[model samples]
Target: SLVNRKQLEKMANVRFRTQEDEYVAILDALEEYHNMSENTVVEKYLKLKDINSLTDIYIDTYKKSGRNKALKKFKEYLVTEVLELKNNNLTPVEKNLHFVWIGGQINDTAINYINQWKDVNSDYNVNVFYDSNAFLINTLKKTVVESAINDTLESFRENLNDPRFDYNKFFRKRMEIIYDKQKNFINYYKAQREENPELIIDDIVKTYLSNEYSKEIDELNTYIEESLNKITQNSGNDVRNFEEFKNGESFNLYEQELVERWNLAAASDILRISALKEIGGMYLDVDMLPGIQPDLFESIEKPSSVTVDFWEMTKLEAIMKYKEYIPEYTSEHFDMLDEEVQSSFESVLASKSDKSEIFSSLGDMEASPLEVKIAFNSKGIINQGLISVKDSYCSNLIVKQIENRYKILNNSLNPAISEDNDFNTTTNTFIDSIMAEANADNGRFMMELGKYLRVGFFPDVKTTINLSGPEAYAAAYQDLLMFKEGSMNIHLIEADLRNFEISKTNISQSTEQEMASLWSFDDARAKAQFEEYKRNYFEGSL
Candidate 1:
């Protein structure tokens, strides 16, 4: 039975704007194969793996996976089609190549990478996009002030009703504490206004005072505001109007919250994804350098592509480490530790590392546990430091996958929301039970679930996985291999960081050399780093 055009579109989760003819042809083939045995159609498609045929098989399998238990195998075939294309076939069309950079300030570190990229491919053009200046400044104040408040609150957590415990007063005091601490940060940028003409001290000041605490401490806020106004008269370039900047409108409810509460670093990752989806080009983090000439991608004809790498530490392993170390922390001991130790502990706990290990430990059970063997054993990371895509199926799919995961992450916070179950009632029930029991402490539960299931947190790992890290890419990539296949897809190529190593002698002077030392590493370094990292995370002696 041939499906109507509307039904096909709905089933595919895509709209055919100018590709109606191709869309119809795909449907016609699907109709022809409707009566054939599922294996026969799959066998035919596997022979060549043509885009149109694979799409048809995907639609048919998606429909069957709902009811036909025997045809479950078809789902695997569809998924394999996507992963094969992603892992092997994505090559760039060099003529349409574009580059993008998303950052707050274009410092020497940024310029160095930019120069390296330009030197490697002198002909390619690069577009730079800056995040919201106000948003970034506000986020910084908020993070620091919030941390101060949390620390202050923890001291009184045991005595909620203590007469001396005045949240309003303590809150204002913490705000003062952060303001003084941030003087160096603000003043540094203010002084650099001459060297970096793009620095906007006025905007930073306005954003800093625009917090919820501003109204309560209006006197101090006003003083701060006036001081900054006198320091700088004009704001710099409006990031919103940047030519390459694209306003992300497709985010769901959860995504909106994630963005609003974004860690500045996490916000950059999310925005970079939007830039790639809306404008179709390269998205490079400021820290990255040119490992291969942009020209080497000339032979690729694919609409977009990304590289596959591994993480240093798995999320599960990190969580396990966190649980073991939670009882070790106290306000007394934390204050005693040096600033460096404190930062290392915070970074280790907050970071989302080791994409491959997390994937292997969580997502690979039903996926032939051996599927992520190399990445898991070695620790894989599907880095977002480099991504290239046009308005294609895979690019859009990846973005959509990020959105979906973002939604799931929010839902995971609520114990009542159960995942949509197909035939795995037992698994679903177990998940529901765990979630319900763990609702009392969702943070602990999330870390625990992350051990065997793909789970992301709002405040710890935050939006890292959903926005920029490897999990969303890996999860979405693996999803592409499922019963559903996107209308247009992209490919991914795994380029080892070692292949693009910079000289060790020039490491300090060269951005490429610095990156080489970090990403261009192996087990010896990984083991050694972990050995040092594990102890610094918790000072249990308190």
Candidate 2:
């Protein structure tokens, strides 16, 4: 053969295949052509082949250095192309913008936000669901908004167009829509149940309902397989990985089909997912002020929706909080904060300060920052602040899980919102507990220690951000993109891809007059607020 052993051995994977490794076939070819032993070929070639793929795998310097780097470059190129093709092929995020206020009192800032949100996202259909508990508050707030809301968002498609828009009808209609699909599926299952009464609804959901989504996935698998094969053509594990993709992957949501009749907190948790499941759209917290509104439908070139890892969100929140301590500090300066800030910040986190003081002073109903830190360090929660999705199978699964959780917790998925309903608080206790224990030695939160000495400490704030808060929405997108029923054969994107900008990061701060005015950029109104932030950020550097 004209090709030498070294050249012949260029292509990579040793045992299991990856984006980096060369085909064993090449190793085999090296052995075959040179008649060298496997051990000899490995020593002579692979020892050198290793670093070529492993270095800066991130930056251009190393990516361009190794011949193996071409593997990553090619894989990325193919992956992008593959996602573009899928974007054209798959369903899109619906044009609906939803918000919820379980409590009755509507703030002017929230109103202004909704108005501004409407102006920029003009294409979006807007909705705001009020709570049944807040009848008087809702009435009073609606009255306040009647003209202002009209000229505001009301100038166009203001809050549901009806001043006293009926959330009761909205929710009941959503339940009906869910049950309609569910009832239809049950009829088909009823026949099989009569013949063999062993099949459970959950099993039926998994087999038929969830599996229905799998068919679309099965179709996408064709493109995914083609891409995998094209990229790994020489490695010959294309068929193997594809088979693993099909067989091994199943979505696992943190489902506890048990739920107890809870307060607006727990009820609202399920409400957000339920609403998204039935209607298909973007669900934002009433507090989420507008910044960087990209067409979520378009941004989802890979995943069915966008998601944020709890760790990343927490890290950012901490970074932002740290920035609060230091006037006008942001990454336009540097990736790492001043080491002085780092030690000071971490020292404050390490404080054993009474978490109640820190949290309560900061308007958090919850008790502890220790608990917060533990929860944040846990297996990363998906932030629910800005959830964007399409009406599809996986969305149904999560909302159904909520109902199932209700069944397990309260023995009925359909829990009426009444004065008696309590917040489902127990189960979330463990998720918090378990993760806290898991990361107990989270290496001394110096911020807390510093707070004990000085803070009394770090951005002392908290909200009841437990099970029903970010967790539910987090699970929805995670289930949608990570598992089989999710975008299995497809690629996925993060919340940042859509430029998720959260204006009101702190819940403890103030108001109607405060809403009308501006000072701190963080709490400042998003459009003008964010623009000045970006501008000042530039000047801060100069």
Candidate 3:
């Protein structure tokens, strides 16, 4: 007979508190050999010098060598006698609050928000967990150059003799061409400034870029520069705990699988839940700024849950609604809005033809962003960034649910591969099969896993909503809620989006430069309008 997962967990909790290396090994062993008996695992892999002298049960088993009566007693004793281990030997945070940061990279925007949160809750203890992966940052940099190259190419499409255009060279060395163009433009504007004293440097650059090769070059530059500056400014300023990715120590089976199989975004999501389970506290996305002070809810009592209100309909559902109401849309599309709403949306779009304006009008109606509509369906939305869990039981339950979810996902792995194919080709084929099978309506992978996890991830579905993102978080939390007697002490409160804002911080500066830069193009536009209002007052326009 084999020990069940729950029983193995209980044993690990009691005995492996200080033996992480051994604990991880046991988990890995179980994961590798699905049918291995727990008794055989302990006896074979425990690394005891002498079987009789290792543990009381080991000694008794060695003496008897047949019935294994002592092993059963030992298992029972481990279950009933051992104290349930809490993560990191830390007690439940009663007085001080703990905040966690998890993301691809840390930037100035995130650091500034974190500082503001620290100032607001000066009494709380804050911890940041940053994954040093630069994939997202690298992608942002690539987009800037690619957009600039595309814009330049678009301009030279008809002009065969333009000195700035060379199709083959442009494709090969786009970055160099962009850099040279920016230099030429800057020198030209500086000479013009010598003639026209009243010309503002910012306006000169924007006008020239707008008049010449598409304004996207200038826009993306500002966006890229700001992000780079933010990253440079906040580099290594905070305490960065690196236990999760640190080498030398073996990882738990779940962590190993996550690192190996899932995408960076998925891995980030899973790690955050694990961190919360290990150390019960708050986990904030890089962009999620804290709105209220820590002491604001000190009197609310413990074993409590705190969350901020986000879009109720998932991104998928919202997209479906948009398509339902308005399909075959264009840049001029505003039919979904009423007369005034349409006018308001068009007004911003006319003045600042950026995606930010599009978000501004939609945000007023509490509607989903256009970008989300293009990428995913909005059915149910849960903000995982701003979750606070104090109860260990709840935290553990959530972690367990996430683990189970991954286990189910992993089971989709193909057991056999074609002997004729190469390793890389076979692996890719297997991965494709799993991905495809997971999304097919009647596939066994989803049919069995669907009972526990509710999420639909199709490669054809082009949305930022990740498999391990809010959808997974919401589903896991809902499952936990079902197991609880009451409402699970969860609290969903409203906070001013202004305080929790990111992606478009200091938007007036970005807007004045005629460039909108941020994660969501819609968010950038909305924030730009808000900045425009404040700028008008400061400049006496109001």
Q: lDDT values of the candidates?
A: 0.39, 0.34, 0.36
Q: Which 10-residue window in model 3 sums to the lowest lDDT?
A: 367-376
* Better-scoring candidate (TM-score), 2 or 3: 3
- Sliding window of 10 residues with minimal summed lDDT for model 1: 361-370
Off by over 4 Å in 2: 1-92, 132-263, 292-383, 387-390, 404-466, 473-542
For model 3, the superposed segments whose C-alpha errors exceed 4 Å read: 1-105, 132-264, 292-381, 389-391, 411-466, 481-542
Residues 28-82 of candidate 2 have per-residue lDDT tens digits of 4334434433433223223223322332232343344334544454334333432
Per-residue CA lDDT of model 1 for 1-542, tens digit only, reads 22433455455443333434544555565454443454432343333234345555544645643322322333344445444433443334222122332222334445544554554444554555443334234434445545555554554454545555443344434444443445434444445666677754434444444452343335544544543342222222334564443345443332232233323344455555565555554555555433321222223232122122111111112233443322221243234435554445456444544322111111111111112111111244434343444443445555665565444445543332233332234235545654664543233423344322211211122235434455555544443344343211223334422211222211112122233331123345544533342233233211
Q: Which residue pairs show backbone clashes in model 1?
A: 79-481, 91-300, 92-300, 309-381, 310-380, 310-381, 311-380, 311-381, 393-488, 394-489
By TM-score, the better pick of 1 and 2 is 1
| Top of the candidates by lDDT | 1
TM-score of each: 0.43, 0.31, 0.35
